[PDB]
Every structure is written in structure tokens, then in C-alpha cells.
Design a protein around this ligand. Sequence first.
Ligand SMILES: Nc1ncnc2c1ncn2[C@@H]1O[C@H](COP(=O)(O)OP(=O)(O)OP(O)(O)=S)[C@@H](O)[C@H]1O
Ligand SMILES: [Mg+2]
Lengths: 261, 261, 258, 157, 152
Amino acid sequence: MFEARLVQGSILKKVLEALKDLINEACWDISSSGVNLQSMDSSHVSLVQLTLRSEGFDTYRCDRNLAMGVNLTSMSKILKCAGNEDIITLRAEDNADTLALVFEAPNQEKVSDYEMKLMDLDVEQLGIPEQEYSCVVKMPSGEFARICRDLSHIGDAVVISCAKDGVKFSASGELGNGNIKLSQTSNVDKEEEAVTIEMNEPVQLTFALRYLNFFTKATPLSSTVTLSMSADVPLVVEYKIADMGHLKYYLAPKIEDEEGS
Amino acid sequence: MFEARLVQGSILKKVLEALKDLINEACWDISSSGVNLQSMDSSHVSLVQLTLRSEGFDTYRCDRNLAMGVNLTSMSKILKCAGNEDIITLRAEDNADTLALVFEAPNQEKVSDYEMKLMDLDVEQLGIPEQEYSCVVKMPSGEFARICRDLSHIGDAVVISCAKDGVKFSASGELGNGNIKLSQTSNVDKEEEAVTIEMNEPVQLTFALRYLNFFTKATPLSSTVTLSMSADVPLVVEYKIADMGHLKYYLAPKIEDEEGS
Amino acid sequence: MFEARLVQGSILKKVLEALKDLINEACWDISSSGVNLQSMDSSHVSLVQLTLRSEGFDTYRCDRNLAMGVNLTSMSKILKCAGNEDIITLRAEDNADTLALVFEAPNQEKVSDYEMKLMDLDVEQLGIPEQEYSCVVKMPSGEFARICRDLSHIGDAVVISCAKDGVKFSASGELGNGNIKLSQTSNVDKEEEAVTIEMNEPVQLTFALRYLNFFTKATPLSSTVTLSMSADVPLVVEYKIADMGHLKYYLAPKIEDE
Amino acid sequence: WVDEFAPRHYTELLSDDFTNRCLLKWLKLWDLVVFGHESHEQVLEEMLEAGLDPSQRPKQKVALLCGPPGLGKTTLAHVIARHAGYSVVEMNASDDRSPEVFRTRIEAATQMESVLGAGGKPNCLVIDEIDGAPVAAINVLLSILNRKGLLMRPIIC
Amino acid sequence: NLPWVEKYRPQTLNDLISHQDILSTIQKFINEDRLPHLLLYGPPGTGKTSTILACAKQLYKDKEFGSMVLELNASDDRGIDIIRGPILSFASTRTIFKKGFKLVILDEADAMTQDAQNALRRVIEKFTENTRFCLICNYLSKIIPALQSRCT
Ligand SMILES: Nc1ncnc2c1ncn2[C@@H]1O[C@H](COP(=O)(O)OP(=O)(O)OP(O)(O)=S)[C@@H](O)[C@H]1O
Ligand SMILES: [Mg+2]
């Protein structure tokens, strides 16, 4: 018997509006550590890794480990009928197939029990490497979301660079060239508006713009986002939820072969 | 000679967007009691009654009864022309083929005389039986609109169940069942959230979704909504708009399935 | 070399959103006086005269007089993701194919350098439009945009008439007849709301409503618009922005009068 | 219904060894660009050995496995792509009708630098029922083939 | 002034003649509220439209005849867009009027194709308790035997 009590529906709402245009079907692993979502997209390029800890929920109870799989657009439309100040009760049992979302409304008088039908897809678990990378940059999430929306217009795929100085965004689009470079943003009053460089080895890699745009729809979950780049292991975009868990997006590069000349 | 003056212009500018997509024309009937407007939808499912009494107007001049037929397509764009707190007047002659709507421009500088033609439409009054309703619910209006918007994401035909416990709005679609039940909201400070049940015998009626959305298009007219239903009587949605009169929506249920055992 | 830094980006974004469907390309003439843009439609229906003087910018540098024509929609994609309060850097070389926009849009020190290519168009010359307009009326701009939308709601063509009381608008159609009639309201606290009258020889004309909407999509650009019309001369709307320059729109009347 | 008797290695294929040998030769010919490693039968062996692209690519980049709809050509391509060091990412041209979602399933799904979590497991594209696809989709695939970014992953139609 | 057929059209079950067994059975079915989907077929001008209009004015009043009766005829092309168009949306709806079935008078039903008659067979079998169809036609043999097997 799996029962999770989300304290606020806003974080679930932002998680689902982040994952709405990326994943065909979402798989949840349920254990005493909490809930896990390690999955691929509809095109087998990106990876989603959502971890929700046990202490973040109001009441979290689980007897046996559960591997459920649900349609995602159906769950987006189910969660669309919900407020932002209501506790959310995810219910499932041992030997059935219905996922129940029970929450309050903004009237705070009426219960709302939305049933859903799961899927029977057996998905091989891909092992996350959990290795070190070549560059780690801490940056506020609104900056990354607005620069993804700003950089989607110039081109179709973008090359990003990180070095000892700071982070760099480049786009060789049909309109022309778009190049930004930001470093040493820590000299403000706010603690969110800060860019921190951790590692040494500079990296330049190109990625599709649409996957970055679908990654940046987790904007108000975390005030600060973490970007990890490496030459071999994929690009990591990590949103740290404050008292619930974390959410990582992994993005594979694209081919940019040099000219023969 | 018909002359009417409203106290605030926003009455028409909230009551005519509810008839923008629901009904195709307007049949104004003039009398010493005031103005009324009974229109059946083109699909003969939805019925709109609008009754504005003479005491709510600033001034009201009428001599004999008049039947008037107008087109709502241009009127639904002429509602965008007027302001929100201006003073509107309706003027109609005896033998003329055009009616005048005279008000002030939103600049508060310019007299606006908009002239609209009359469609000589041959319509007849149906005649409401006005039977004793088997269940009466007093509810908020924005709550009803957001619950119709909530069940617009599940199925195309909601189910209203009304028992002595209260009202249960349930939508079943290809996604999954979602039910919302209200009961006993008299313990609130404001008097507009008193979701009250006024009759004993339970009913269970299945209604269309787009029609209830077209009905809930009229939220800011009033604060509370009176929903009347019975075993075979259509759904009655009553709005006590300000002090000048009221509005009524009549909706036939959907055809039940052959679920005999 | 050419360089111009605008203090705020809302004016440029808003004027390029004003003429997003009016013209097909934007051609700036660069001199020591400022940025001149005189564009004419392909069907001889509307004309745009936008002047940005050099004193309105923080820095304006120009060596040689230039003429750059770029397809609007391409720069609409540039400034659809700009900022309301930001420093704008518009630059180009003397003989180059590129044009660069450098901005710090979200006040997050993100130096976004956007480059676009120049389109070599045919140089058509329109020297000076004749300005001997008998009927001049100053009117607030946002409510002028409001009543332009109001007249565009009901009809398809607007009959306009100056008179000693004011400016009367009308439109006709098979569902109704729209009509509005101005009155003098100089006794208000708002100086922008007052309508100023310099009109003689009243003239009745007709115009297309969509071009009026394309003109008056620049509502928040200036607090007071000016209308100038006369017999057989195209109607002018005019925004005098208080800092960097002015903007004028010309519309020729329809053949089927009244 | 092919539950445990499915082929998985190169020793379980049910085709003639010449066709499988030349198919494996064409699959391993891409190791110079993908991995970076340095009668009609004689015509095929000449065209598979003599002359290459300057970017270490073969002259042909698409294989047309024409034949009857049965006879297990898809399973053969699957086990050969498993044997050659790639991972099979299959796609279908019959459920894909719109060209926009076709380019999503082709130009936005594979044949880029799809460095996944398994760094030792690259991917290859297998397309079935290319005859029933609309002519816009095959014109799009022809434009992808004639793109000079460069196409590096093999296509097994 | 007016043609004699439009002047002296019969308006009563007794004013139509030689169909006395048919009119007796129709009156027997309509007094007991057991009227099925009807298929009136025969030569032109023998009293097909006027019989069902007399039965409609027996069932319904003058005010609700224009609301609970939909008439389609030779002016409407009878293909596959109509059966998924106005007649399906008419049959699949309730009315704010007294609790009785609707009525659809489809003139020249023999001009429908086999696919159109099968789609109409789906519409007829789906909605029965709230809609009673009336297909009137010249040739019985031009319609499918399934449609003959669901309407009297
Ligand atoms: N039984 C009848 N008694 C008297 N007049 C009749 C009778 N049947 C037909 N008529 C007359 O003939 C006209 C034609 O009748 P209708 O029923 O309208 O034609 P129909 O039988 O539907 O055949 P169609 O429409 O040409 S295929 C009526 O308007 C009457 O004037
Ligand atoms: Mg007939």
C-alpha cells in the first residue's frame, strides 16, 4: 500500500508542467527512501531523474517496492484540475492498477478523488554513472529559462562553452550569430543571483534547443539551478527542491563535423 | 417609444458575453414590468431567460408591448466598444428599423450612438411549467465555473448527483473517474459561500459539458448561483444579478444508456 | 562606423510591434542628425516616417551616411525576447553585410549580441511629403486606439468627418451602423485627455480600419496623438515621443467616398 | 509466439551467409567515422571496398532490404546491429503520417551525437515499411541523405 | 392563387384513403406509444409525406412541430457528411418539451448509398428511445436489408 502526502500541489504542478512536452510515459519506483523517476524521452536522447525523499511528504507510507508506469498527458490533465494550496494524496495498492489523486480544492471544502489507469510497460533501468564532470556552474533558474527562450529564436541548435572565466552560449542560426558570456555574478544583494564555477577543464558542446526549452519548464521549482558539463558524460541540469528532493535532466549532444576544406 | 437607462454600463458588458457563443439572436420583449429575453438555442437544448425589472433602471419609458429581434454577432463586438463605469441607454422608436445604444466613450469625452438593425424573427414563447424543483443548491459562481473547467479535462458529459449530503460532480472519461462532493459550508464569514441544500429526494442527471461551460460564462453578474434540478425537470441555473432582475438557464439532461439488468 | 545606444528598449520593441503587419521591411537612413526611416507600402496605401534624433540616445556615433534595409520579421524575432527596461546597442560598420544588437534585457547582466544580415533593396526616393493640412486635432492616443478598435469591430470601412464640434466617426454594415461624435472636454485635470482644435474647411473621407489598427498599435508610445487631414491629401497620425524623436503615419483615402 | 526462440547473436540468423557477410561489412565500414578506428557479388565487393568519401563515409548510406513482407529481415537487421556494436532504435513509417512528427522521429530522435548513459553502446536506426510511407517523408529522408550536419549513423530501411 | 394539391392537402387520418389498414395500424401504434422507425415506400403521389405529416400534427401541436420534427429532402444531398452532420446531432439530443420522442422525415431515402444506409443503420440502432425515424422512398430494393431489418 503506497500513500504519499504532498504538502503543496504547486511543486507537483511545476514538475508535471516541466515533464509535459518531453516524456511519453512516466515510471515511478516506490521504496522506503521515497519515490524515483528514471526514464527516457519519446526520442531516446534525454534522461529524466526525479527523486522525492521520504521526509518531504506529510505522511509517506509504503510496504513493498512498487514499479508503476502511467501515461503522462493523462496525468497532466488530471493535475490541471487542482489548486496550489492543497495537500495531495497519491494512493495505490499492492495488486491493482488504479492511481488515485485525492486533494482539496481552493474552496477548501470539497474533496477531489481523481482515478487514473496505469500502464504495463517493462522498462530496463539504465544505470546513472554518478561520476564527476568537467565544469559545474551554479546559476539562478530564471536566467537559464529566459536565456533558453532568448536563444531559441536565433538558431535551431546551440553550442555552449564553459571555461575558467564563465559560461558561454553560442548560436549559428539562419538569422546570424548569437553569442553571450557571463561570469562573476556574485556581487549583488540577492543570494539567488549568483554564478559559481567549480571545475577547471573547459568544454564546448552542442545541443538541441527544444530539449533545453523543455528542460527550462521546471523554472519555479528551484531558485538556483546547477549545470554540469563534461566531454563524454552528458549535460546535467539539476533543480534542487527546497525540502522535497531534486530533479535532473540529462542531455546528449549533436553531430557537428568539421569541414574537409 | 422605448427608452431605458442603466445605472452602470458593466451589466450589459457582463451579460452579453454569456450569449456570445450560446444563442444566435436576441428576442427583446418590452412591458411595463420591464424587459425580458427568452431564447432557445439552435440545437434546442439550452434556454436563456433574462428578466430586468423597471425599478432597477435609472429611467424607463414604455407605452406598449414590443417584440424585437437582434443579431448577437455584432452586438458581441459592440460590447467591447463601451467602457465599464459609463451610463448606457437603449432607445427604440415606434416604426423605425434601427435601435440606438447611446452611452459615453471610455475617454469620458464623446457621446456614442451605435445603431443596430432589427431582424423580424418569427418566434414564439415556450412557457416554463415552473414546477416544484426536487433539489435546490445555493453555490458560489466562480466555484461552479472552475469546477466545470476542472471536469472539462476529463469527460465531455458531467454527472450531477444531488442528495441530502450535497452535490457530487463526477466526470468519467478515457483518462479516469474524477468526483467532487460538497457539503455544509455554512461556517464561513462571507455569505456567498453558503453551499446549501434545500430539498430532500436525491437525483442523478448527466449533462453536457460545453453547455455547462457556456452557462458558467456568466460569473461576475452575481455572487451566488441557484441550481434547481429534479427527476425529469431540466437543470435551472438562476442568477440574481444585482437588484434589477434575474437570469435563468434551462438545460435538458443527456440520454441515459440502456443499463437494464 | 555606426553606433546607437537606446536608454530603454520598450520604444523600439513597441514601434516594431506597431508596424509588424504594416510594412514588409524596415530601411533606416543614418546621418549626423539621427535615424530616419521612411517606408512605403507595395500597394501605395500607407507610409511610415519615423525620426529618432541623436540627442535622445546616450551615445550616437555616425561616420558616413548609410542606408540599411532589413526584413522586419527577422528583427521581430530579435526583439520579441528583449526587455522593457534595458540598454540597447544597435551597431553596424561602414561597408558590411551584418547588423548587431547588443542588449542586457532582463537586468541580469546577460550580454546578448544578436547579428542579422542586410537585404539589398531598390532605393526608391520620397523627398518631402507636403504638409498644408487644414484640419488639425490633438487627441489622447490610448483612447484613440480604443475607438479605432471600436470602429473596426462593427464595420469594414470608416467614414471620418471633421466638424467645428470635433471629429465624427461612422461605419456601416449589414448588421449595424456604428457612429460616434466628439465633444469638447477641456475642463479636465488630465492635460493628455484634452482635445485641441485647429480645424477649418471640414472634409469627409473614408478609410480602411485594419490600417488604422496597424497605425494605433503604438498606443503607449505617446500620451497625445495628432490627426491631420485635408482634401485629397492622405491623413496623418503623429506621435511626438518626448525624448528621442517622432513618428508619423500616412493613409490615402479610399476611392469609394461616403 | 517468438518468446524464447528469438535470435540474439550472429549464430542464430536464418539468411544466406553472403548477404549477412556483406551487410556486416557495410555496418563495420562506418567504424572510421562513428568509432574513429583506422557477377553481382564481385560488383558489390568492388563497391564496398574501392573508393570512399573524404569524411571516411561509404558512397551509400541507406540499405534497401527489399523482399516479401515476411522472411525475418527486421530480426536479421536487429541481431546484426546488436552484433556490430550498436543498439537498435527501431521506428515505423506507417503510424507516422505527418511530416513534422516524422522529422521529430528522424531528425530529432537519432543520427546525431546521441551519447547516452551507456557510453560503450552507440545506436543505429532501423526503419520498416518504407514503401508505404508518403512521398513527403521519403523526400525528407532524401534531403537528409543529401545534407552536406553530416549524417554519421547508419540507416537500415 | 395556389395549386389545388397545396390547397386540399389532407390533414386527418380519415382524409387519407385506400390506406385504411396502414392508417389503422399507425393509429393503434400511436395511441399506445409504440410507434417504431417507419419506412413508407411506394409510387410517387400516393400519400407518403401527407400521412406522416398528419401523424406528426396528431402527435405534436403547431408550436412544437418546428422543434421536434426535422425534415430533410431532395434539396439536401444524401451522402456520408449528412449522416455524421445534422441528423445525428438532431437525434442525439433531448428537448425541453414534453417527454416524447423526436421525428426525422427523410424524403427520398432510396437515393442513399450502401455506406450511407449503413451509417444511418448505426444512427438508428444507437438512438431509439428518443428518436423515431421516418424514411420514405420509391424503391424498397434500393436500400440494404439491414436497414429494412431495423425499421418497420
Ligand atoms: N390518400 C390521399 N387522399 C387524398 N389526396 C391524396 C392522397 N394521397 C395523395 N393525395 C394528394 O396528392 C398530393 C401528394 O401527396 P404527397 O404524400 O405529398 O406525395 P408523396 O406521397 O409523398 O409522393 P412523393 O412526395 O411525390 S415521392 C397530396 O398533397 C394530396 O393533394
Ligand atoms: Mg415528399
